[PDB]
Amino acid sequence: VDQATLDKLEAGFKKLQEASDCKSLLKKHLTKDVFDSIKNKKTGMGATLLDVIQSGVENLDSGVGIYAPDAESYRTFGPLFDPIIDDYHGGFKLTDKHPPKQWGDINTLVGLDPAGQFIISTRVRCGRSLQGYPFNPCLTAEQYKEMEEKVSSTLSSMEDELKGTYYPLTGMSKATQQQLIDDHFLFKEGDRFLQTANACRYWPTGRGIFHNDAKTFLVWVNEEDHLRIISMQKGGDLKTVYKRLVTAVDNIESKLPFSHDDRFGFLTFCPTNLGTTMRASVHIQLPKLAKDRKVLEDIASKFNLQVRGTRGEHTESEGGVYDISNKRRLGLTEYQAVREMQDGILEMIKMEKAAA
Ligand SMILES: Nc1ncnc2c1ncn2[C@@H]1O[C@H](COP(=O)(O)OP(=O)(O)O)[C@@H](O)[C@H]1O
Ligand SMILES: NC(=[NH2+])NCCC[C@@H](N)C(=O)O
Ligand SMILES: [Mg+2]
């Protein structure tokens, strides 16, 4: 680690210390003790602590504030990742290991809103990383295209319901891009947290989206993660959505080699996405409980749920519509993760009916 990087690290650490109202996990867990132990370390690909923490230093409103430039980073800079991971995922000890993949018994899932008065739409996603490829900040332009090629070529082999077409972001019209985003299908452009993590180089090269014609099955290519595998539809039929996601992931896994870790499960660019990599969410209205989103979030948190805006994280609710999902992804199975969303949402609905 060259002096120039150390200076910036020392300066970044200071900025974090001074931010009295900063509430990031980065600030909370990057103590003086922790910092000194790992600030001089570097990975085989040349990733430093600066690469890890830089997004959180520049964006003080971060909830987490760190990313892994490569797989090695999770251990090289373990003393920072470990406590942050433990905090976010609601408990994960040094001696803990993420459990084996287990979708569980899908038929044990129930109807979340038969009368259709609360839930607008349901979505479940997972993420995967390709073996032999580092995370965004270490990729070259050429690497983005190979990955784009391999993944797009693989998904052309999807069959039946999952059969679809790959649409590169390159060549996609501005009008078309915005419509896909407004409809909650395509990842947004220009995320300040990712940019400062050097996750958006060469944009939009290598980026795109695969989906079936109904747009119930989608794959994001080369956004935050190499792949995001997505099932979603209008209404509240979580059972169908989850079953479709499983089918897709199982088929894709048989074709593409993904990075998996004995302790951290499936690897992702952000530590919040480790393990199951699963985020099961609904777009839901809860007018009595939502009359102050800060109250809503407090209710959600006790159920291990996270609240996001209608257009995703870092956005406001529109028309009283909130995105509510399981927060935890690591140290629990896929089934347990999806059940936490189900169970929490079922209870929040119970509370909504009982509310004044
Ligand atoms: N339950 C849902 N129903 C409909 N659209 C959703 C749902 N959950 C997320 N989305 C959409 O997915 C897109 C990705 O947003 P993010 O909040 O970044 O999710 P991810 O876990 O996919 O990174 C956003 O446009 C958001 O509208
Ligand atoms: N990985 C992801 N898409 N969201 C998790 C939080 C990201 C981090 N930049 C933050 O502190 O917002
Ligand atoms: Mg996202």
Q: What is the 3-state secondary structure (H, E, C) of 281-332?
A: EEEEECHHHHCCHHHHHHHHHHCCEEEEECCECCCCCECCEEEEEECCCCCC
**Are 136 and 237 within 8 A, CB to CB?**
no
Q: How many domains does the chain have?
A: 2
- Experimental method of this PDB entry: X-ray
Nearest atom in ligand 1 to the alpha carbon of residue 312 is 17
Same domain, 126 and 40: no
Same domain, 86 and 216: no
Q: Is 218 helix (H, G, I), strand (E, B) or coil?
A: strand
Nearest atom in ligand 1 to the alpha carbon of residue 310 is 27
Q: Which two tokens stand for residue 119?
A: 């839930």
Number of H helices, E strands in the chain: 13, 10
Nearest CA to ligand 1 atom 7: 123
Residue 48 DSSP symbol: B
Documented resolution in Å: 3.0
Which residue do the tokens 């290598």 mark? 206
How far does residue 66's CA lie from ligand 2's centre (Å)? 8
As annotated, the binding site includes 63-67, 121-125, 184, 224, 228, 270, 279-283, 308-313
Same domain, 25 and 123: no
Residue 98 DSSP symbol: P
Nearest CA to ligand 2 atom 2: 270
Q: Is 283 in the pocket of ligand 1 (CB under 6 A)?
A: yes
The CATH number covering residue 8 comes to 1.10.135.10
* Domain around 20: 1-94
Q: Is 235 in the pocket of ligand 1 (CB under 6 A)?
A: no
Angstrom distances, CA of residue 59 to CA of 29, 245, 264, 274, 326:
16, 33, 26, 22, 24
End-to-end CA distance of the chain, in Å?
Answer: 59
The rounded distance, in Å, linking the Cα atoms of 4 and 345 is: 49
Q: Largest alpha-carbon pair distance within the chain?
A: 63
Cα 72 to chain center, whole Å?
Answer: 19
Same domain, 81 and 125: no
Q: Is 224 in the pocket of ligand 2 (CB under 6 A)?
A: yes
Please say if 159 is a catalytic residue: no
Cα 131 to chain center, whole Å?
Answer: 19
Cis peptide before 168 (omega within 30 of 0): no
How far does residue 355's CA lie from ligand 2's centre (Å)? 32
Same domain, 178 and 71: no
Nearest CA to ligand 1 atom 6: 184
Cα 251 to chain center, whole Å?
Answer: 21
Q: Which two tokens stand for residue 174?
A: 């501005």
Same domain, 72 and 109: no
Q: Is 111 helix (H, G, I), strand (E, B) or coil?
A: coil
How far does residue 228's CA lie from ligand 3's centre (Å)? 9
Nearest atom in ligand 1 to the alpha carbon of residue 121 is 3
The number of the ligand nearest the C-alpha atom of 183 reads 1
How far does residue 315's CA lie from ligand 1's centre (Å)? 11
Q: Which amino acid is at 230?
A: I
Nearest atom in ligand 2 to the alpha carbon of residue 268 is 1
Same domain, 6 and 68: yes
The CATH number covering residue 328 comes to 3.30.590.10
Mutate to test the pocket of ligand 1, among 273, 274, 281 (most ligand atoms within 8 A of CB): 281
Please say if 272 is a catalytic residue: yes
Q: Which residues pair with 167 in a beta bridge?
A: 209
Q: Is 272 in the pocket of ligand 2 (CB under 6 A)?
A: yes
Which residue do the tokens 């452009």 mark? 189
Same domain, 270 and 352: yes
Residue after which a domain boundary falls, among 37, 64, 94 = 94
Q: Is 317 in the pocket of ligand 2 (CB under 6 A)?
A: no
The rounded distance, in Å, linking the Cα atoms of 93 and 337 is: 18
Same domain, 67 and 36: yes
Residue after which a domain boundary falls, among 73, 94, 115 = 94
**Are 61 and 27 within 8 A, CB to CB?**
no
Same domain, 224 and 145: yes
The rounded distance, in Å, linking the Cα atoms of 226 and 112 is: 32
Same domain, 28 and 122: no
How far does residue 184's CA lie from ligand 1's centre (Å)? 6
Cα 224 to chain center, whole Å?
Answer: 8
Residue after which a domain boundary falls, among 48, 67, 94 = 94
**Are 223 and 180 within 8 A, CB to CB?**
no
Same domain, 74 and 213: no
The rounded distance, in Å, linking the Cα atoms of 303 and 337 is: 12
